[PDB]
Amino acid sequence: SRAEDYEVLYTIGTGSYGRCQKIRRKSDGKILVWKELDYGSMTEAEKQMLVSEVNLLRELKHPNIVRYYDRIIDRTNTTLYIVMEYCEGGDLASVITKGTKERQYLDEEFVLRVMTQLTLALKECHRRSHRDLKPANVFLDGKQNVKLGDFGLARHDTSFAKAFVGTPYYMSPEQMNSYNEKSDIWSLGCLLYELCALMPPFTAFSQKELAGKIREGKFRRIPYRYSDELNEIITRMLNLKDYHRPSVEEILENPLILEHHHHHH
8 A cells, every 4th residue: 555565676677658666565575566657647537547447457366467466656756556466587578589689499388388378368358358469568477477467557649659650560450450359369379470480470661561461361380390280270360260260268279288388376
């Protein structure tokens, strides 16, 4: 409830909408993070819609979704802190960057973990109907656990540029032309493909050239070090027809997915 109940260790990264900080809860020394959000320029309406979301966030409890812990308001600096689980392994974008730098591909076992644990995260999200599946929104803890952590809450000058300058590599064909769970399967397919090939399935120097590419639905096979089975399931998620993509259930029924690919806390 109070900011004094925690101690900032250090700033992990400055988000587009405020700092993320590694913090220690005083009572037990529990290592955590919080997101620093300056609501000083918000309207009474934005702050109510902002509350609605913190509450929905509060309501997710899943091993494969970044755990919400606490809210804190510091009215003196008009700062809202959102306390969250600390994920020691960082995000998947950094992992993918690392794979490029060191010119080495990620173990198939790792891809299976992300596939399994992210699919389970999606199924939870779907059940409760922010689940945008970019590498930067997916985290690893210290026990080979994978957690989804889209923090769209934080979303207008810096939200305009990000929506406008940013390239929609993961945009399904349908969403190019409402809610559609099969659109999330496509995004997952794009994510896992990039985890394998270290580049997105569709790439372009223009959103129009990217739309054309996406509409054809053609991409390179992932590297040959990855099994034909893994390539099949990923290819299936990248199908042009939403109804040809696997459901969450069909994905988890795949013989590739074993117990040890699931979370272990």
